[PDB]
Amino acid sequence: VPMFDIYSRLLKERVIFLTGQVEDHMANLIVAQMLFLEAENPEKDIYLYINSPGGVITAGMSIYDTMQFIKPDVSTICMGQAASMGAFLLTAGAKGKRFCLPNSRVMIHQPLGGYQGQATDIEIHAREILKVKGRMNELMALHTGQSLEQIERDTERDRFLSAPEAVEYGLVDSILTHRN
């Protein structure tokens, strides 16, 4: 990692990178960077680049709730891909400030999970992932402006969206083409 090191200087310009699989510890680092920037200045926008194939729902939810919680607007920019929990956090950005780069791609689907144990415990845990599915679809509908029923239909199986399609789906607000 080349020399403030490269990421930490970009953090001074309110830039945060979410990269790779979503799990607790990289999630916590994003949360901490957001909380830190809100302290440095609750008025200025935060920029979160998202290149991710997805990952742990509860961990992405910590970034989501931090995203809504803090004062600053969190702008999202998708480069490479934003899949599943990655696509969910991209559309979670402040309305009007969610972006895809021209050849970034997006994928949405339904929650994934797995359990082993007794029938009683399996029902508990299956009941809970369905509640998570419903919560995601609602939040998904809310950020995209699609109906709940459109989210449900379209996430039952993997659905890919090009950058233009994700603009037209309401997942992002526009494409970043070149700096003016």
Ligand X SMILES: CC(C)(C(=O)NCCSc1ccccc1C(F)(F)F)P(=O)(c1ccc(C(F)(F)F)cn1)c1ccc(C(F)(F)F)cn1
Q: Tell me if 43 contacts its own copies by CB under 8 A.
A: no
Contact predicate 161/106, CB 8 Å:
yes
- CB nearer its own copies, residue 129 or residue 167: 129
| Class of residue 33 by CB neighbours under 10 A (exposed 0-12, middle 13-18, buried 19+) | buried
List 48's β-bridge partners, or say none.
16, 76
**Distance between CA 172 and CA 166 in Å, rounded?**
6
**Interface mask (CB under 8 A) for its own copies, residues 71-100, using x and -?**
x-------xxx-------------------
Mark whether 143 is an active-site residue. no
Choosing from 84, 104, 125, 178, the catalytic residue is 84
Q: Choosing among ligand X, its own copies, none, which partner's interface includes residue 75 (Cβ < 5 to 8 Å by kind)? A: ligand X
Residue 27 interacting partner from ligand X, its own copies, none (CB closer than 5 to 8 Å by kind): its own copies
Nearer to its own copies, 19 or 150 (CB): 19
Q: If we measure between CA atoms, which residue out of 127, 77, 75, 81 comes closest to residue 104?
A: 81
Closer to its own copies by Cβ: residue 3 or 96: 3
Report the interface residues with ligand X, using CB under 6 A. 9-10, 12-13, 15, 35-36, 39-40, 47, 66, 69-70, 75, 77, 79, 97, 101, 176
Question: Is 32 in a helix, a strand, or coil?
Answer: helix
9 neighbors 17 (Cβ within 8 angstroms): no
Q: Which residues are catalytic?
A: 84, 109
